[model samples]
Target: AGVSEYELPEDPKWEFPRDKLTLGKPLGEGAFGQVVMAEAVGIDKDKPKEAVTVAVKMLKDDATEKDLSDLVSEMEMMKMIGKHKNIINLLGACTQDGPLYVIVEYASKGNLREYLRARRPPGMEYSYDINRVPEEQMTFKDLVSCTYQLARGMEYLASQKCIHRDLAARNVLVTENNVMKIADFGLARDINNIDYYKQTTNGRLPVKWMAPEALFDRVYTHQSDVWSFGVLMWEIFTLGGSPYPGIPVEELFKLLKEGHRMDKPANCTNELYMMMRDCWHAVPSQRPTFKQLVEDLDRILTLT
Candidate 1:
């Protein structure tokens, strides 16, 4: 039989340095490490009382070279991108200890997954819990707000020549004020950098969000991001439903090879559905650009 209960780890081992970083409760956990809510102390000497809540990501010493490189790359990218209202802000990093810690502006409201999970319909089974009941249905207005903020963030990322390889609801963080910001740039890369695309190997692709060309380990262009954006749109409107539900990955490929594509949901408006279709087109050249997507979304927003 499984253990009845587990004991908590030692204080010093798990606890962060309160003197330098005032850590609060944990926000989330993943393969990398746990993200805890924290505040920077004495970083800005002039403003001693000016402490901004942040999410501290602690990387274990046993982290692989690829993991380390990814973390470093994300940090460098954040520094280069600076603080855009829509982009998750990275304040500072601590590498003095055995584990590398990254301090990012805290999103008090937590990630989009939490919000989506909260809004899921009751009686629906989630991946985590089979017998658990989902939350109440989310309003169309809520979806609109989330999608609008995401589009704005993507527009900003495109302007900076950066492609957010992982553009899912889970990567989006919502603030208490309902403001949305794109987080997790571990898969983000510069679209303008030809070498970056050429150097990419198979299995690096985000299959669920990737376009057809990208799925085949072929060239990934800006148009590919548009495809992912469309998938994101579906995920947002559907309250975090999986892409191509009821269809397996291998079957999805077979269908695609047979000139078939996932149909847009009936609940989505005609304009939005059309946009999604354009993004999922078989030919990469036919996919819409980020600028076009922004303009189209703006037009739709005006109608609403």
Candidate 2:
């Protein structure tokens, strides 16, 4: 073993029974780990004859204590979060003294970003249809349902006083039945910290989904997360178009400061576009709350 061993600040409550898990093929890779498909034999005690399929997110074979600590904390946070219909639920973990393994419910269709992209022809070309590519894009009812679920997930996170520092389409998962879930808690922080997480190396906030205040003064909060949600909405509306198209990150601030924002996708409704703008308000307080987003999205979903 290496000099540094995997360790957790405190032993977490729930853990997956390692003996019960039969690991399978790899699904995808994340920043620090790869997700693999696995089966839990007799996961349901009452239904001991049944097996359950799960997604296991595990660190690299040579992960350090620091890496494991980060992962373990994420499990702890997800455990505290419990389960919600629109958010990824922490099933269990293969916790040990070495590199940690987290087993969560499997999202058969994968992340929402890739799921949306896959709707196009195999040649793999697609476009935002609100203006041009009508055959390839999501219909208004489908789009509203997708977005409404996202808002619902975020609303649950905010109510728990948690800040998902990195919220984006890529972080969302979709199931076979088309259920959308907010996933990946690696960048999440507790809102209890009045000053928020100070370790800049900590959040690993994505530039494209970032808020003006967070990008400028290093301030982060539920409000900052709200801003990222706006960008995520833009991504979904545009069928995952790159936010700010040709503009580089270095020049993004200048454009934003000048009151310039992402133009509406051709297919995006006027009402929907306005909500995205409300989330981008320069003043954090001016931005709508996640609760408000839930209400707004529910209304839009009802209309469409």
Candidate 3:
């Protein structure tokens, strides 16, 4: 196996009191923080505290004040959406010290990206430059399972009037029981008026997974979210493959102006291909709603 091994930092500072918590192996690392498998060590009788095992997300200390504020805001959002089956349940948070820590449900199977990577066929080669594995193929059954779970999660989020602005495989976590839950609401926003879009001062966006409107710095409504869902569908069907292949970020602007779009993977079925096409419609209003998406996904699953 040519896979690069990840090394944990020695003498890593624990944001929470080590006496009150026992940290296991490092679960994963991301741009903002590292998630560790942890268990509560101390319990207070009067407080009736129970020793619970959870995933502890420790934010990087070098994160800016704005990042800290955003983390707090995301934690507040999670508090509002506690214990939802389709959403990653945030048990609690430690906000006393500088480096913030959040306790979430322990998803033993890890995120969808890891799950798909683990399922990669033999002889597949990963490309770190684009975060993809060329020639990695997934069966139709795999696609159906992935699409069904994602649609179920999206259906739940839509019912709550919440939009998961970043709905990529990495943000979706799978449990040992084969349950999929949407995680990482740091980029989520509440959908208000049907046509309203929030303005971003920095113009920073997730271009790879984003719809056209979101990338153009225009209004992003529920329809835009639908477009993103289509891209997500592609990722699901293709075993977490990148949307655009051999396309650079700067050249995307020119390509968009010319009405170019991502090509469907080689093994995609006609129905699934059509669904992905509908999601990338130039007119956001023309995109299918999550309700319609769920129905279509159900039909696709029946074919399995």
Candidate 4:
């Protein structure tokens, strides 16, 4: 309710073609980024023959300054960080009475998590069965593709001195061509030439993907993000399975504290599981960089 009512500082040159954009079907929603499909008119004079589809992320109702800043700050980060094939590109921002919106290129395939889920029979239509492992499992080759692409994107982010803070299957978007692009930058922060950021606990947290030091203390660094990529690797192997099934939030921290990691996914190779285990190392600095993950993933992909 107390979402930032503050207006963008009025500057004539800062104006965007706000009114020309119209909302379409809702993409998805999170606490801070309430996303929806949108169509932009006029701007693309040369390509008027094709309808231009985009995404708009609005400030959430529960947004305090912490949420608002992170949400709004994505615009700047996208601008400076600019143009990566694996990273979702931001189009622009709009100021309004209802909710602040940041326009971005829409991924027709939606988020990677749901996309992967829909690939299986159980995740299709009205079938709600969770017992079966689904009619089909994704090829380890495709899994390697997705993981490789994501780590490539994260490697770009780290190179730009940005910490994604949230890197999971759910946060990744995919195109019809099966190209993966990392999205949901509402929690991103610059590491400021260091490895980690002293995380402020006021914002949302993706507990399952967070590193141990990050979960207990507010320490977040690029290496901790490496820990997250490891969990993401598990998701790829499991075919969109949840990180820890049947584990309640109350007991998750305890188990992690006890050094228990998620069991290797069915059909996962010993080498792959070992790759995942390396990411969950107790020492934060022990985690591999996104570059390393990309290299390792490339090596893994060579499997028959």
Task: For residues 1-304, write the lDDT of model 3, one tens digit per residue.
Answer: 1112322223222223445666788988777667898886533234446666678777675665555555665666676644577678776555553346776778887778767765666556444334343344456876777787777778777776777788888888888777788888877777755656665744555777677777776677777778888888777766668778789878887787688877776668878889988988888878888889889888878868
| Model 1 worst lDDT window (10 residues) | 1-10
CA-RMSD of model 1: 7.8
lDDT of each: 0.71, 0.80, 0.71, 0.78
Query: Which candidate wins on TM-score?
Result: 2
Ranking by lDDT: 2, 4, 1, 3
lDDT of 4 by residue, 1-304 (tens): 3335556554333234677788898888766558889887643558754458888877667666866777667776776677899999977667654456788888988877777776654434356655443444466777778888898999999888888888899889998678999988877888776756887665467788888888888898888888988888888777788898899877898999999899998868898899899999999777788888888888777765
The better candidate by TM-score, 2 or 3, is: 2
On a 0 to 1 TM-score scale, where does candidate 1 land against the true structure? 0.82
lDDT per residue for candidate 1 within 186-301, as digits (tens), equals 87887665633542556565567777776665666667777888888888777777788898776777677677666676457766777778988888778887777777777777
Where model 3 places Cα greater than 4 Å from the true spot, the runs are 1-20, 41-51, 97-99, 125-138
Which scores higher on TM-score, 3 or 4? 4
Global local distance difference test of model 1: 0.71
For model 3, name the residue pairs that clash. none
lDDT of 2 at 231: 92
Ranking of all candidate structures by their TM-score, best first: 2, 4, 1, 3
